[model samples]
Target: LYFQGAMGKCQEFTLIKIYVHDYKEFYEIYLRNKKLENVNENFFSQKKIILLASTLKPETAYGQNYTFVNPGEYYYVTLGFNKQRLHYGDKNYVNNVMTRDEIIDSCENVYICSENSLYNLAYQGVIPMLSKGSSPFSDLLILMKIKGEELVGLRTYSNLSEKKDLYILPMTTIKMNIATAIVPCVSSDSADDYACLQDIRRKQAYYCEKYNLKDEFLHNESFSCIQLPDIGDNTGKYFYEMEKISSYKDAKLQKVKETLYKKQYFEGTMTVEPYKGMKIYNCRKLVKQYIIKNNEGFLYSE
Candidate 1:
């Protein structure tokens, strides 16, 4: 039902506040050196919540698996004065559009998570906090390392996995903070995608076997939105089972990985309505362009 209504060029929009930023230090660094002055200010909005991410393919966002966040890190910006357990994992409304009255009524303080700050925060490193149900960062991504706890839950519109709200499963490999919005689909073409899958399955099976859990229950959890020629729906699961890619260390894993990616990246296609059958790169541009034209899709948080 949700997909039926939202099926189009502009998938959807999610609201997110800029829980993190450094006004004072930004002035000294980029402003003092070069770049735009309002550069820092441009990342947010006084009217609405915007979604952002440093590295994204916009097109494959539907395959998003989790929205990552440093669950343990915190930086009191003198905003959220609620000394209570104002934890990091807690999420607010989808949007933060405040009216004149809302401004006066709002008195919440802020405590953000991320490793960088005003002087050090790279604009690229600053996350939109709300990704468009899409990708992750470099081996290294840091908005900060907070309550230094972290989160990795599936997105609402993921086209890859059917898994619902799988949060903080734990991945052994990550740069600084891939929490920006790492898309975790079954046949994810990226290095982390492959690496993470192996780790998750291993732990699930190990614990399930040691104790008395159902390890075989893969939840197989995925929502395949892209349709590749010859390869029915999900390429990852298809390859995972066919190639018997039991672990990342498997000999046939790389070759299997190549087959899935090569076909998908260059020849595979999408069937998600508006951009159906179009190539990845072409659709990627259209998706990004759709976001920009909508005057939304921009924001940053710890």
Candidate 2:
């Protein structure tokens, strides 16, 4: 089986195309190696397809396709278009170089979905439509935030026939805390355990009330204390310390107290240690998640 001049070596490459409008959008074409058993499968077949762009010259053709010679494994391919000349030819093929606004505008109209409805129509024929809801918006939303920037408008897409009423919202951030401390409970076997728990509960309640912190569940006999901080100078450290405290509390309740705990756990901690700053975009995302979770329901829809 070792008789060859030069055996063919498959090379893998990704085919990417960008469509211009107010911004640039991208599509990928991939070729996969087929085994004998799956050689005839429809999934392994090749077909020509057109991807429509939001801004297109009436006389200019706007379709692109590239064949990947070697296609056995997965590879990440990046494509970008700038907002300033996306309608024309403004090509930039580098990672993490595009600004947040450039990313948003370029990716605003790109949509991906499993179902082929009117959305598919845009990509199928001449004079394609670049309207929203042409395809599913979920994947596009994720792509819009690929650079870790906060996605301003996060909403659900209803039937296209209904109405065009989607809007963007403000960004938010979520803060976290971690810790590694004792639950500060009186050992049930020890006579002072109940007294210790009582003292801790009183201190916690007094501090919470003074700070106007919402105390949903607080009691003396059966109490839990979480040491987490609100917006402050050392908020990062507070979040880390709080996590440690929460873990310790959970372990102690399970092992020593042998009590079943069922409540939304919230802990707080403080630290004076110096630390590096976090990315502004990441902070915004964390805050956004917190707001969305705590808020009753989604705000923007059409």
lDDT of 1 by residue, 96-115 (tens): 22232332234232223334
Give the residue spans of candidate 1 off by over 4 A.
1-56, 68-144, 147-149, 152-166, 177-220, 248-259, 295-302
lDDT of 2 by residue, 179-271 (tens): 000011111111123323233345665535443222332231211111123433322223223343332223232222211110101222212
Give the number of colliding residue pairs in candidate 1: 32
Query: Which parts of model 2 are misplaced by more than 4 Å?
Result: 1-95, 103-202, 210-212, 217-302
What is each predicted model's overall lDDT from 0 to 1?
A: 0.38, 0.21
